[PDB]
Amino acid sequence: MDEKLLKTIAESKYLVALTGAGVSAESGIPTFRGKDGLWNRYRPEELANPQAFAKDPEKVWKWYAWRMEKVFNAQPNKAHQAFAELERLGVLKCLITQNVDDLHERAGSRNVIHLHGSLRVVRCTSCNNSFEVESAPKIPPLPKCDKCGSLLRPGVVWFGEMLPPDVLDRAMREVERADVIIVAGTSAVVQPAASLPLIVKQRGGAIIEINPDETPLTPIADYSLRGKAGEVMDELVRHVRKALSLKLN
Ligand SMILES: Nc1ncnc2c1ncn2[C@@H]1O[C@H](COP(=O)(O)OP(=O)(O)OC[C@H]2O[C@H](O)[C@H](O)[C@@H]2O)[C@@H](O)[C@H]1O
Ligand SMILES: [Zn+2]
């Protein structure tokens, strides 16, 4: 939290952010990897891939319905609140997230790109049709599409599946013009999301990493803050807001 970092943020021309599961950990939602990560307790091979869904849609749906309830009942934390505020202040231009929760939105963030989909969305496996839900469905029975008599599935991106072209292209455009990118709460291993911060660096921008652990991105991060996103972002945005308020205008 040195003056150099604060200056980089407060004076940025087009700051964007990329967030991962770590930004929602302080909301009581576990992450995917690490200590008590979901992929350490559960097997992604039976829950997060098209083959697993086709093999046992009931098992996959029961798990996602559980995750949905957990997310819908959770509250945004200080990190989510801080990103929303950084956007309100006119500093953060776009928030790109790998998270399938809607905590960024519930905290007030407006320009959000969901690279991996959302637990709020459910769609048909047959016809190209989707819609959002207010609460989690009960499983069984299997959620069915009332547009062609087929199965509905969680509107999230599974391993091996292609991220929607329009979504990734938009995110790509955002990082192509960003001069600063805050990368918070992500392990930087899952592609193509992990490649986004590299674009910023290759084009001449700065990377500000926020994570209690070091990651594959750490070596090229201009700044790498070892701490929880809630604490770090709250302090960072408060200092940025203060700095901006001091400007003679
Ligand atoms: N309070 C916290 N504040 C900031 N970061 C934290 C916090 N707590 C944990 N982290 C960090 O969050 C990171 C989470 O890494 P992942 O669990 O791999 O989450 P993510 O990078 O978003 O996963 C990417 C993708 O893979 C999953 O299969 C899924 O599709 C997901 O979107 C870890 O590096 C971890 O150290
Ligand atoms: Zn359908």
Q: Tally the helices.
A: 10
Distinct small-molecule ligands in the complex: adenosine-5-diphosphoribose, zinc ion
What is the H/E string?
HEHHHHHEHEEEEEHEHEEH
CATH homologous superfamily label of the largest domain: TPP-binding domain
Total separate domains: 2
Distance between the termini: 26 Å
Helix content: 25-40%
CATH architecture of the largest domain: 3-Layer(aba) Sandwich
**What is the radius of gyration computed over CA atoms, rounded to a whole number of angstroms?**
19 Å
By secondary-structure content and strand pairing, the structural class works out as alpha/beta
Largest sheet, strands/sense/barrel: 6 strands, parallel
Strand percentage lies at 15-25%
Rough shape? elongated
| Tally of strands | 10
| CATH class wording of the largest domain | Alpha Beta
Question: How are the strands of the largest sheet arranged?
Answer: 3-2-1-8-9-10
Binding site for Zn(2+): 124, 127, 145, 148
Pfam families: SIR2
Catalytic activity: N(6)-acetyl-L-lysyl-[protein] + NAD(+) + H2O = 2''-O-acetyl-ADP-D-ribose + nicotinamide + L-lysyl-[protein]; N(6)-succinyl-L-lysyl-[protein] + NAD(+) + H2O = 2''-O-succinyl-ADP-D-ribose + nicotinamide + L-lysyl-[protein]
EC number: 2.3.1.286
